[PDB]
Amino acid sequence: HKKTESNQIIKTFSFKIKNANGLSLDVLNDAITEYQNYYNICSDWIKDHLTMKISELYKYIPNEKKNSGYALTLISDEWKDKPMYMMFKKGYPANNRDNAIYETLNTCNTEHYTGNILNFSDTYYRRFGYVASAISNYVTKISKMSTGSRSKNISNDSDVDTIMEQVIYEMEHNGWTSVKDWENQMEYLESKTDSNPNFVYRMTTLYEFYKSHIDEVNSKMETMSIDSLIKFGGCRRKDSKKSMYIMGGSNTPFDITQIGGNSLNIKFSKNLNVDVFGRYDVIKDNTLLVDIINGHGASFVLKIINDEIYIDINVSVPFDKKIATTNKVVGIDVNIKHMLLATNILDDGNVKGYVNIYKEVINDSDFKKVCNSTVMQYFTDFSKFVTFCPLEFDFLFSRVCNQKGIYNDNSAMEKSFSDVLNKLKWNFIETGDNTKRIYIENVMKLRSQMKAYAIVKNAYYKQQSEYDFGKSEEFIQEHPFSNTDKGIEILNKLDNISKKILGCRNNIIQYSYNLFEINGYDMVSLEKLTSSQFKKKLSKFKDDFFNLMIKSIHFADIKDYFITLSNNGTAGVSLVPSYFTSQMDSIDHKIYFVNKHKVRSSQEKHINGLNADYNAARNIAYIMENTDCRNMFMKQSRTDKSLYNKPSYETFIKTQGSAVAKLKKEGFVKILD
RNA sequence: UUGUUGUAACUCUUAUUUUGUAUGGAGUAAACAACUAGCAUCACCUUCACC
DNA sequence: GGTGAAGGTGATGCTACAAACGGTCA
DNA sequence: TGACCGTTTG
């Protein structure tokens, strides 16, 4: 837009306020409410005029600004006879759109802007903060607005209705309005050596169709878009997000200066003068770790969290991160049925800083006397390779049964395993080692908090059923269980438990990543779980337990924290396909298709002979440690952009069918019995 | 100990089966790890009332 | 099995300005 | 009058 980043990243730091010179909690809350009200009214105005001629807005510009650059574009022949939503597209000039819409809002004055509570100057608060925020939100809504034409695979060779639908999809989904931009994209595609002619045939055919069919395709696209936007509820602003955004001017006074005691003073314009506690990553012993003094942006955010006022200062900081080599790849099978992070590393006892819980659970005198043969075999198999956070779900359910009074088979080994974990925690407490003790306590706390989350969420469901029963539809649809006092208390408990679960999971992930860094590994591989693949469903309690507590750990987000760690770390993270890692044999690297997930049936083991989780981890590692398999499946990320929160390598496979078709061509297939 | 979050040890305390190996509360206490945030939209899942 | 509300997760997209003009007060 | 800083324009 107006800020450009080159080999750098914009980092936002939230600072807790202290000595707020008149910026009280109630006053800031009222100011935030007024800001949200103004934003909502402007969004409503944008909605009500969204399917309206652009050149009609020219009548709103004041006479003294008729010769302005942006006003001329309003009545220019290119956009003279187009609906207003067309300015929220790549073709239209962004700055002209912003200025023209701001002028229309100011002249119309659909909300009586008499001034805000905090007495910010009008330019920032109105023109730059909320009007610009609303315009940017409507841009991000309209730009990729899919009229409902679902893309289909059999592509060009079909009927004329197919041609129409696919041309609409291709013009819209990537945001095209003009033929010139489309021709520029075709030139870009033809410049690239990697043709991929299968899609190129479709692209060229629909380009040729669009060449001589502009009038009716434009008319039908406009009609479909208008139809979609009539029933659009508008970019409304939620009331549960207490926040306010301000943008300073080019010459505005916005100075941040140290005031001793690891504190900072923020002085913006003339109506803002506050002090902030500081942060351990920006200031350390009165010394600065980031160039916040002379690198901070001109925009800040005032927000309230837990009835505490924060201010967000964002700074452009250098970010030198490269793609990671693959001289030593670590595969991680993220399946949380038994453990949390399976790994393809054999545990020979020479992994520096690694504690194997499974190794010292099967070597515990008290545990041997209780665990049956099958579980003992499970734990002997797991202990042979590196693994993290033993998370036996049936064990948590047995604990739930113990609490609820229902007998369960695993009850004795529950106490046994917990006693082993506590013994490990105390051994590491007395030994003085910090990281291992942190890991052990995090595993124990996470195990307890998943059960707590399940209990509290089941109680939430039961209480919602109790309160909602026998009431009118209007009464419950306007006064839901979420916003009542009992509901808000329950959701507060849920949020606390969720935060603690996320914290323990992040600590475990960081421990694993530190282990990988110390051991000399260079690359980390995970499945690209775009969403929870297990998100679909007396034993109803067990099923709900398992499902909601899959959802609680942020099962698909576990990779995201791995990339977050890789940002400042020295090991890269890749997202490999999640369609066939659990089915590939790891000896000959082939696939059993004749597929079906029921391969892992014999005592939690694979037909190959190795353990199922170990097999999947080995497959995930192999996807990246072999050049051929990477080139087949794995596309290196763009090194010209920023690698912050971006994998070093990532898949271009979007469905199971494409993957299974891709395997067959080069081999990698076998037949089951 | 200069922010948020997760993780200790130690001394008390009702309360909580709407966190019973855990949490709220009071006191004390230290090292180690992460932290790009805001706003809007879309998709999906779950629960609940209804048929 | 869907229609509505709520909760949440996951993904996406804009955005975090630069330079010039003009009002005002020492 | 020049010098901050709120306002207007790409």
Across A290-306, b (16+ Cβ under 10 Å) vs e yields: bebeebbbbbbbbbbee
Q: What HEC string does A159-182 produce?
A: CHHHHHHHHHHHHHHCCCCCHHHH
Across A403-432, b (16+ Cβ under 10 Å) vs e yields: eeeeebebbebbebbeebbeebbeebeeee
Does residue A243 reach within 7 angstroms of strand B, measured from its CB? yes
Distance, CA of A29 to CA of A38 (rounded, Å): 14
Partners of residue A111 on adjacent β-strands: none
Please state the φ and ψ torsions of residue A302, each to the nearest 5 degrees. -105, 120
Distance, CA of A212 to CA of A217 (rounded, Å): 10
Distance, CA of A391 to CA of A447 (rounded, Å): 7
CA A438 to chain centroid, in Å, comes to 27
Distance, CA of A661 to CA of A472 (rounded, Å): 53
Distance, CA of A233 to CA of A74 (rounded, Å): 26
DSSP 3-state of A237: coil
Span between the terminal Cα atoms of chain A, in Å: 59
Would you put residue A175 in left (φ > 0), alpha (ψ -120 to 50) or beta? Answer: left
Cβ(A361)–Cβ(A367) under 8 Å? yes
Tell which residue, A124, A103, A69, A119, has the closest CA to residue A251: A124
Q: What HEC string does A555-575 produce?
A: HHHHHHHHHHHHHHCCCEEEE
Does residue A22 reach within 7 angstroms of strand D, measured from its CB? no
Distance, CA of A275 to CA of A257 (rounded, Å): 10
DSSP 3-state of A50: coil
Partners of residue A392 on adjacent β-strands: none
Cβ(A59)–Cβ(A39) under 8 Å? no
Return the structure tokens found at A217: 């395709």
- Residue A560 is which amino acid? D
For residue A445, which nucleotide's C1' is closest to its Cα? B22
Does residue A314 reach within 7 angstroms of strand C, measured from its CB? yes
Cβ(A333)–Cβ(A617) under 8 Å? yes
Cβ(A581)–Cβ(A333) under 8 Å? yes
Burial of A500 (0-12, 13-18, 19+ CB in 10 A): middle
Does residue A528 reach within 7 angstroms of strand D, measured from its CB? no
CA A318 to chain centroid, in Å, comes to 23
**Total residue count of chain A as it appears in this document:** 673
Element (H, E) at A245: strand A243-247
DSSP 3-state of A650: strand
Tell which residue, A629, A620, A515, has the closest CA to residue A575: A620
Quick one: how many helices (H) and strands (E) in chain A? 23, 16
Q: Which residue has the tokens 């803002």?
A: A272
Q: Which residue has the tokens 């047995």?
A: A398
Distance, CA of A282 to CA of A295 (rounded, Å): 12
Neighbours of A443 (CB within 10 A): 24
Distance, CA of A620 to CA of A653 (rounded, Å): 15
Going by their DSSP bridges, the two strands A572-576 and A523-527 should be labelled as parallel
For residue A312, which nucleotide's C1' is closest to its Cα? B37
Tell which residue, A517, A501, A560, has the closest CA to residue A354: A517
Burial of A47 (0-12, 13-18, 19+ CB in 10 A): middle
Cβ(A94)–Cβ(A74) under 8 Å? no
Window 266-285 of chain A: CB closer than 7 A to strand B = 277-281, 283-285
Tell which residue, A641, A12, A620, A4, has the closest CA to residue A299: A12
Rg for chain A (alpha carbons), in Å? Answer: 29
Residue nearest to nucleotide B7 (CA to C1'): A438
Dihedral angle computed from the Cα positions of residues A214, A220, A221 and A225, in that order, rounded to the nearest 10 degrees: 160
Going by their DSSP bridges, the two strands A523-527 and A287-288 should be labelled as unpaired
The DSSP-derived string for A427-455 is HHHHHT-HHHHHHHHHHHHHHHHHHHHHH
Cβ(A605)–Cβ(A598) under 8 Å? no
Return the structure tokens found at A291: 């160039």
Does residue A655 reach within 7 angstroms of strand B, measured from its CB? no
Residue nearest to nucleotide C3 (CA to C1'): A473
DSSP 3-state of A6: coil
Residue nearest to nucleotide C16 (CA to C1'): A299
Burial of A116 (0-12, 13-18, 19+ CB in 10 A): buried
Distance, CA of A239 to CA of A126 (rounded, Å): 19
Q: Which residues contact A407 (CB under 8 A, 6 or more apart)?
A: A401
For residue A245, which nucleotide's C1' is closest to its Cα? B38
Q: What HEC string does A260-289 produce?
A: CCCCEEEEECCCEEEEECCCCCCEECCEEC
Q: How far is CA A512 from CA A387, A388, A436, A523, A549, in A?
A: 9, 7, 11, 13, 22
Distance, CA of A128 to CA of A134 (rounded, Å): 10
Going by their DSSP bridges, the two strands A287-288 and A308-318 should be labelled as unpaired
Distance, CA of A388 to CA of A510 (rounded, Å): 11
Helix-, strand-, coil-residue percentages of chain A, each rounded to 5: 50, 15, 35
Does residue A6 reach within 7 angstroms of strand C, measured from its CB? no
Name the method of structure determination. cryo-EM
Distance, CA of A58 to CA of A425 (rounded, Å): 72
Distance, CA of A530 to CA of A575 (rounded, Å): 10
Element (H, E) at A75: helix A69-75
For residue A102, which nucleotide's C1' is closest to its Cα? D8
Cβ(A528)–Cβ(A577) under 8 Å? yes
Element (H, E) at A15: strand A8-18
What is the experimental resolution, given in Å to one decimal place?
A: 3.0
Tell which residue, A665, A3, A671, has the closest CA to residue A299: A3
Q: How far is CA A172 from CA A97, A241, A355, A629, A639, in A?
A: 20, 31, 53, 34, 27
DSSP 3-state of A362: coil
Please state the φ and ψ torsions of residue A2, each to the nearest 5 degrees. -110, -20
Going by their DSSP bridges, the two strands A329-333 and A523-527 should be labelled as parallel
Return the structure tokens found at A374: 């099958």
Partners of residue A254 on adjacent β-strands: A268
Distance, CA of A331 to CA of A333 (rounded, Å): 7
The angle subtended at Cα A550 by Cα A548 and Cα A555, nearest 5°, is 135
Cβ(A582)–Cβ(A608) under 8 Å? no
Instruction: Give the domain ranges of chain A.
Output: 160-230, 329-665
The angle subtended at Cα A194 by Cα A193 and Cα A199, nearest 5°, is 125
Does residue A578 reach within 7 angstroms of strand C, measured from its CB? no
